[PDB]
Design a protein around this ligand. Structure first.
Ligand SMILES: *C(=O)[C@@H]([C@@H]1NC(C(=O)[O-])=C(SC2Cn3cnc[n+]3C2)[C@@H]1C)[C@@H](C)O
Ligand SMILES: [Zn+2]
Ligand SMILES: [Zn+2]
Ligand SMILES: [Zn+2]
Ligand SMILES: [Zn+2]
Lengths: 384, 16
């Protein structure tokens, strides 16, 4: 027997234990030590299932998120579902499932960071292009949400207003190989990477690790926060077997990107919260950065199943980090064909604010130090 | 048979 809220976390614990030790912890007696912050976790559960912290439009709107310790890669809270009036043990943990499109939140890790990393761009002020543009190799247009084109704009503003044209084109200038490599270093992969992926975590498999889940996004954005170091998500700290033996799990890092890249990305993403999209996640007293996401429906879907004139979406996403914690939010309905309307779209950002409020208040919120090889200028940062 | 789960503080939270 076990608590209501812990269901999702234990499921991953069991999965991780037998991946590293090869023992289903239900068929073998062993004491296992985890990274779950109980208070934080109960607080997470409280944001989902009350009227205290977030105003929901209805009882079946889903939220799914994962919170990581940026310094070691320890998942401290996870919750893939809200309101579960059918308690069957260890259900489908949506928080690690990848079968939903993370849309624009893929831009930072797939497009601009690698672009900067491999020195395709020199500054957060480099002028990039939002003009009529086509997916390379095809006569298919890359539309923006507003169907318009902002023209000549800076990289920073491009990320902020979240324009699809400069995003896609930037994937083309990085190269598809380089990008697949960069995503791997951030723990994300596709069987096959395509230009569509510059604005979508939409994959062909999702049989395993392919695509993006709140797990893999939290793990990726933590690298932005700590200066470019990816840690594999961890749930377990130590195992003690019946036979007295003990295996401790030390979580080691890998260089995902240069510290200057990690910084430049952070700096731009700061403006997302302040001047642009995720203002519903803005905290005046907390040094944080993020990217919003609003996926869309397919051509088939638009005509046959979705019937409205309004701004609608199957998924709304947020992916923010502070100096200490990384958190990635997914929102939507179990059946994708139920669209997100008006107020439903703010939930992702509001959820993050609420949970980030809790973890940060008390300890002094430290900002990011501008590191060797970068200097400050106007609204932007430049290299050397 | 019987397994015990402990949070980040090391306090028991689940028995499986
Ligand atoms: C990405 O998911 C999506 C675009 N990015 C966003 C977003 O960042 O939320 C949007 S909605 C956008 C509408 N608007 C005006 N001012 C701020 N915002 C939020 C679009 C749909 C890609 C895939 O198109
Ligand atoms: Zn609380
Ligand atoms: Zn409360
Ligand atoms: Zn161009
Ligand atoms: Zn292709």
């Amino acid at each position: 027997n076990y608590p209501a809220y812990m269901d999702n976390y234990l499921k991953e614990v069991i999965n991780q234990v037998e991946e590293e030790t090869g023992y289903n912890l239900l068929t073998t007696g062993m004491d296992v030590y985890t990274n779950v912050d109980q208070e934080a976790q109960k607080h997470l559960w409280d944001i989902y299932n009350t009227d205290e912290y977030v105003a929901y439009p209805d009882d079946e709107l889903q939220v799914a998120s994962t919170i990581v310790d940026v310094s070691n890669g320890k998942v401290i809270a996870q919750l893939g579902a809200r309101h579960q009036s059918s308690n069957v043990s260890f259900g489908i943990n949506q928080a690690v499932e990848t079968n939903r499109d993370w849309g624009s939140t893929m831009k930072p890790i797939t497009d601009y960071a690698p672009a900067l990393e491999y020195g395709v761009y020199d500054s957060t002020a480099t002028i990039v292009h939002d003009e009529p543009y086509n997916y390379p190799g095809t006569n298919t247009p890359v539309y923006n949400w507003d169907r318009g084109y902002f023209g000549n704009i800076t990289l920073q503003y491009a990320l902020q207003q979240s324009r699809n044209v400069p995003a896609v084109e930037t994937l083309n200038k990085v190269g598809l190989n380089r990008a697949k490599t960069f995503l791997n270093g951030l723990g994300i992969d596709y069987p096959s990477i395509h230009y569509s992926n510059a604005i979508s975590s939409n994959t062909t498999e999702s049989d395993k690790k392919y695509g993006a889940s709140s797990e893999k996004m939290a793990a990726a954005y933590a690298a932005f926060a700590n200066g470019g170091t990816y840690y594999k998500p961890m749930y377990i700290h130590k195992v003690v077997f019946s036979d007295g033996s003990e295996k401790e799990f030390s979580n080691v890092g890998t260089r995902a990107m240069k510290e200057t890249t990690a910084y430049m990305m952070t700096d731009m993403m700061k403006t997302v919260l302040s001047y642009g999209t995720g203002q519903n996640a803005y905290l005046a007293w907390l040094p944080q950065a993020g990217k919003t996401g609003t996926s869309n429906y397919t051509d088939e879907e638009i005509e046959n199943h979705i019937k409205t004139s309004q701004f609608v979406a199957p998924d709304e996403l947020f992916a923010g980090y502070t100096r200490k914690y990384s958190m990635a939010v997914w929102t939507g309905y179990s059946n994708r064909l139920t669209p997100l309307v008006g107020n439903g779209l703010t939930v992702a950002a509001k959820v993050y604010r609420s949970m980030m409020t809790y973890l940060s208040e008390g300890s002094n919120p430290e900002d990011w130090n501008i590191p060797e090889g970068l200097y400050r200028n106007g609204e932007f940062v430049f290299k050397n | 048979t019987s397994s015990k789960i402990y949070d980040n503080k090391n306090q028991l939270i689940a028995d499986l």
